[PDB]
Write a protein that binds this ligand. Structure first.
Ligand SMILES: C[C@@]1(O)[C@H](O)[C@@H](COS(=O)(=O)NC(=O)CCCC[C@@H]2SC[C@@H]3NC(=O)N[C@@H]32)O[C@H]1n1cnc2c(N)ncnc21
Length: 265
C-alpha cells in the first residue's frame, strides 16, 4: 500500500541513546522484527528468573497479539507502536495495582495528544484502558502479572488502517497526522510512562487527578459488559483507589473491577 511508504523502521540505537542512561529509569531496550506477543515474551523472561524491571521490548510486528479477557490484538508490520515494559510492583500494596494500568493509558494519551492539529470530540480515556480519539480506539493497554512484576503492554495505532484490525479502530494517520514519526512518539511515550509509573509507586494524587481530567467515561451513560456475559446500565461517576469503576444505577452504587464499557447517548 501507500501507507508502507509512511512506515520507516524504528531506530533501536537512537532509542537506546535517548532512553537509557543518567536521568532515565529504563535499563534495557530491544526492538525485534517480529514476535507472537511482547507481553508473553517479557512474562517468559520473568518466569525464567530475569529481572524485567525497567526492561522495554518493542516489536515491529506482532502475529499473536493478546487483548484483555482472552481477546486478540491485530497488527501489521511497522503500523503500530507495539511494546511491553516490566514493572516491579511487590513494593506496592496489591489493592493499588489496578491504577498502574490506568496510568499507562494516561501516558499513552499524553504522548500523542499534541500531534493532532485540533482534538476532535470523544478524545481521551475509556475505562479501563482504552485510548479513544473521535470515538475510535487509538490504543489498547494490557497489564499482566508475574511476581514480583507486572508486564504492561501497549498497542498504539500509528498508521494502522482500521480495515486491517477493527471497525471501531482509528490511528494517528486517520486522525490527520500526515507523517507520524514512530521514533519520536515511542520516545515520548516511554518518558511519559516512566513518570506515571513513579507517580503510581509513590501514590501521587496527581495521577488520579490527571486521569479524571482525561476520562471520557466519568459522567457518561454507560453499558458495562461484565465478565460472564451480564450487562449493567448506569452512569459512571468515579474511579476508586483500586482503579475500579463506580457506577450510579438508579441511585445505587455498583463498583466494577473489570468489564467492557460502551458510552451511551
Ligand atoms: C478485535 C478487537 O475488537 C479486540 O477484540 C479488542 C481487544 O480489546 S481489549 O480487550 O480491550 N484489549 C486491549 O485493548 C489490550 C490490547 C493490548 C495489546 C498490546 S500490544 C503489545 C502487547 N502484547 C500483547 O500481546 N498485547 C499488548 O480490540 C479490537 N482490536 C484488535 N486489534 C486492534 C487494533 N490494532 N486497534 C484497535 N482495536 C483492535
Amino acid at each position: 500500500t501507500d501507507r508502507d511508504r509512511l512506515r520507516p523502521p524504528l531506530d533501536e540505537r537512537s532509542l537506546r541513546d535517548q532512553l537509557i542512561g543518567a536521568g532515565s529509569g529504563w535499563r534495557q531496550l530491544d526492538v525485534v522484527a517480529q514476535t507472537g506477543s511482547t507481553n508473553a515474551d517479557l512474562l517468559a523472561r520473568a518466569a525464567s528468573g530475569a529481572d524485567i524491571d525497567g526492561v522495554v521490548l518493542i516489536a515491529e510486528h506482532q502475529t499473536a497479539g493478546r487483548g484483555r479477557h482472552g481477546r486478540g490484538w491485530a497488527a501489521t508490520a511497522r503500523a503500530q507502536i507495539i511494546l511491553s515494559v516490566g514493572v516491579r510492583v511487590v513494593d506496592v500494596p496489591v489493592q493499588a495495582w489496578g491504577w498502574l494500568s490506568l496510568a499507562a493509558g494516561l501516558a499513552v494519551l499524553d504522548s500523542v495528544a499534541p500531534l493532532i492539529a485540533v482534538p476532535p470530540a470523544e478524545t481521551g480515556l475509556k475505562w479501563p484502558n482504552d485510548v479513544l480519539a473521535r470515538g475510535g480506539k487509538l490504543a489498547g493497554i494490557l497489564a499482566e502479572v508475574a511476581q514480583p512484576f507486572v508486564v504492561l503492554g501497549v498497542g498504539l495505532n500509528v498508521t494502522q488502517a482500521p480495515e486491517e484490525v477493527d471497525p471501531d479502530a482509528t490511528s494517528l494517520l486517520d486522525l490527520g497526522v500526515a507523517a507520524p514519526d514512530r521514533n519520536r512518539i515511542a520516545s515520548r511515550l516511554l518518558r511519559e510512562l516512566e513518570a506515571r509509573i513513579i507517580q503510581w509507586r509513590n501514590a501521587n494524587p496527581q495521577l488520579a487527578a490527571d486521569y479524571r481530567a482525561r476520562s471520557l467515561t466519568i459522567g457518561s451513560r454507560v453499558r458495562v459488559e461484565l465478565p460472564g456475559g451480564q450487562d449493567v446500565v448506569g452512569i459512571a461517576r468515579d474511579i476508586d483507589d483500586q482503579g475500579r469503576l463506580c457506577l450510579d444505577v438508579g441511585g445505587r452504587t455498583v463498583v466494577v473491577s473489570a468489564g467492557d464499557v460502551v458510552h451511551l447517548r
